[PDB]
Design an enzyme around this catalytic site. Structure first.
Site, PDB file in Angstrom:
ATOM      1  N   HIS A  16       0.786  -1.264   0.000  1.00  0.00           N
ATOM      2  CA  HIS A  16       0.000   0.000   0.000  1.00  0.00           C
ATOM      3  C   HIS A  16       0.854   1.374   0.000  1.00  0.00           C
ATOM      4  O   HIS A  16       1.696   1.531   0.880  1.00  0.00           O
ATOM      5  CB  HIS A  16      -0.897   0.174   1.356  1.00  0.00           C
ATOM      6  CG  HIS A  16      -1.880  -0.912   1.708  1.00  0.00           C
ATOM      7  ND1 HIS A  16      -3.162  -0.613   1.592  1.00  0.00           N
ATOM      8  CD2 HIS A  16      -1.733  -2.284   2.038  1.00  0.00           C
ATOM      9  CE1 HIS A  16      -3.793  -1.847   1.878  1.00  0.00           C
ATOM     10  NE2 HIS A  16      -3.004  -3.008   2.116  1.00  0.00           N
ATOM     11  N   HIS A  62      -9.305  -7.501   0.122  1.00  0.00           N
ATOM     12  CA  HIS A  62      -8.754  -8.041   1.314  1.00  0.00           C
ATOM     13  C   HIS A  62      -9.768  -8.885   2.172  1.00  0.00           C
ATOM     14  O   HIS A  62     -10.839  -8.458   2.521  1.00  0.00           O
ATOM     15  CB  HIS A  62      -8.206  -6.989   2.457  1.00  0.00           C
ATOM     16  CG  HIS A  62      -7.055  -6.116   2.098  1.00  0.00           C
ATOM     17  ND1 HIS A  62      -7.047  -5.391   1.071  1.00  0.00           N
ATOM     18  CD2 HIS A  62      -5.877  -5.834   2.831  1.00  0.00           C
ATOM     19  CE1 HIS A  62      -5.920  -4.634   1.089  1.00  0.00           C
ATOM     20  NE2 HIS A  62      -5.190  -4.869   2.164  1.00  0.00           N
ATOM     21  N   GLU A  91      -7.790 -12.363   6.313  1.00  0.00           N
ATOM     22  CA  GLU A  91      -6.544 -11.911   7.014  1.00  0.00           C
ATOM     23  C   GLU A  91      -6.690 -12.071   8.552  1.00  0.00           C
ATOM     24  O   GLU A  91      -5.970 -12.875   9.137  1.00  0.00           O
ATOM     25  CB  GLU A  91      -6.075 -10.498   6.639  1.00  0.00           C
ATOM     26  CG  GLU A  91      -4.853  -9.981   7.478  1.00  0.00           C
ATOM     27  CD  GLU A  91      -4.520  -8.571   7.181  1.00  0.00           C
ATOM     28  OE1 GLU A  91      -5.443  -7.945   6.811  1.00  0.00           O
ATOM     29  OE2 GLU A  91      -3.454  -8.031   7.437  1.00  0.00           O
ATOM     30  N   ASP A 150       3.119  -5.400   1.960  1.00  0.00           N
ATOM     31  CA  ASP A 150       1.960  -4.661   2.519  1.00  0.00           C
ATOM     32  C   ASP A 150       2.214  -3.248   2.966  1.00  0.00           C
ATOM     33  O   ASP A 150       1.700  -2.314   2.367  1.00  0.00           O
ATOM     34  CB  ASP A 150       1.415  -5.530   3.774  1.00  0.00           C
ATOM     35  CG  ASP A 150      -0.101  -5.429   3.991  1.00  0.00           C
ATOM     36  OD1 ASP A 150      -0.526  -6.044   4.991  1.00  0.00           O
ATOM     37  OD2 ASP A 150      -0.804  -4.801   3.173  1.00  0.00           O
TER      38      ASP A 150
END
Ligand SMILES: Cn1c(CCC(=O)Nc2ccc3ccn(CC[C@H](CO)n4cnc(C(N)=O)c4)c3c2)nc2ccccc21
Ligand SMILES: [Zn+2]
Length: 349
Positions: free
Chosen positions: A14, A211, A214, A292
């Site tokens: 990100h 997403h 997770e 990430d």
């Protein structure tokens, strides 16, 4: 030293968490914002984690540093320019980078993010400036870069603008929509605003990741696949808690975007156990390895490669396999994707 000294692909990082200490120090100095420090040294230590923490402690660090870039055109473009730079230095030859455009905006967005006051930097404009910097950065540093716009779980009111943004800036560098935030928010995968964005993504040929799995249940993965129609999964670890869904996703060649060092620090994966990615390597699953938020986790891509090589005995030809699988499951035009694969299979000989 580096675990896998070869070209790499990365699908899951990100932008807003891939920001250098020194540039945050820069911008809010020049802005008056201020920070839990003012060396880009002690800054890294406080933003970085060495230890799991709760979500509140996690989010409040976007609250110290976000206010430094968000709002300021110059700072948006710059962070994206030098994102590409980081990746050049990881040996990456193709990266898809993602972010929410509302979270850097300061205007035409409600609620306004990060206790910012209203300015006149809008989300659409955010995309524009990101684009420029990644594009110019592709030019200077020799890494092919596309980007993905994130809807956010808690605010379905923004997702139709996300998809529209996706359609307007389509592969200038936008190639996909994403769904990020708190995936435990009750029924969030089915909020009509999210559902309808992802359906318009199918209608207009924009690629889709979500997403899921997770920190949520395998019911969250199922919703991402069956209702939002996603093409790849962010993390997906908890898929394994539902065996028939696991087995179907293997048969369908679903790509899982794995983020190993991420998964220790966020609590996703609990260290007395099995890493998830170990199972997936033994099952020949389609997955890739990704960082990430390197800022937050103190890391670079070599981090995750060292973790899998050292703690999990990953080998060179497994690193090769998954990077091939990353490029195959990328969101590029098919012509460009073959061109990718040719580059890599050449490097791997
Ligand atoms: C449970 N949990 C999560 C799961 C993900 C999560 O809940 N994230 C989340 C939730 C709400 C918000 C509201 C804003 N953001 C940040 C958005 C940006 C957009 O590009 N962003 C950057 N990194 C992330 C991420 N890793 O989740 C998301 C959120 C991010 N991330 C954690 C990190 C440390 C400790 C615990 C963690
Ligand atoms: Zn992520």
């Amino acid at each position: 030293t580096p675990a896998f000294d070869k070209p790499k692909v990365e699908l899951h990082v990100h932008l807003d968490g891939a920001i250098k200490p020194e540039t945050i120090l820069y911008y809010g100095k020049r802005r008056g914002i201020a920070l839990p420090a003012d060396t880009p040294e002690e800054l890294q230590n406080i933003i970085g984690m060495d230890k799991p923490l709760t979500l509140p402690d996690f989010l409040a660090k976007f609250d110290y540093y976000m206010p430094a870039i968000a709002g300021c055109r110059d700072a948006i473009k710059r962070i994206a320019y030098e994102f590409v730079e980081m990746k050049a230095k990881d040996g990456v030859v193709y990266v898809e980078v993602r972010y929410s455009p509302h979270l850097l905006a300061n205007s035409k967005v409600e609620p306004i993010p990060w206790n910012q006051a209203e300015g006149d930097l809008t989300p659409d404009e955010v995309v524009s400036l990101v684009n420029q910097g990644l594009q110019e950065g592709e030019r200077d540093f020799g890494v092919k870069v596309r980007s993905i716009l994130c809807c956010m779980r808690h605010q379905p009111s923004w997702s139709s603008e996300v998809v529209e943004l996706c359609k307007k800036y389509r592969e200038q560098t936008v190639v996909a929509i994403d769904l990020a935030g708190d995936e435990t928010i009750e029924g969030s995968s089915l909020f009509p605003g999210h559902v309808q964005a992802y359906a318009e993504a199918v209608k207009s040929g924009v690629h889709r990741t979500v997403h899921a799995g997770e920190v949520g249940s395998a019911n969250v993965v199922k919703e991402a696949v069956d209702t939002l129609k996603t093409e790849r999964l962010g993390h997906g670890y908890h898929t394994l808690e539902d065996t028939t869904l696991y087995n179907r996703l293997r048969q369908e060649n679903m790509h899982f975007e794995i983020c190993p060092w991420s998964s220790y620090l966020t609590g996703a994966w609990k260290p007395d156990t099995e890493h998830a990615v170990i199972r997936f390597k033994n099952d020949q699953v389609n997955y890739s390895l990704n960082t990430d938020d390197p800022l937050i986790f103190k890391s670079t891509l070599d981090t995750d490669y060292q973790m899998t090589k050292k703690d999990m005995g990953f080998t060179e030809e497994e690193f090769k396999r998954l990077n091939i699988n990353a490029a195959k499951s990328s969101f590029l035009p098919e012509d460009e994707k073959k061109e990718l694969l040719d580059l890599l299979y050449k490097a791997y000989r």
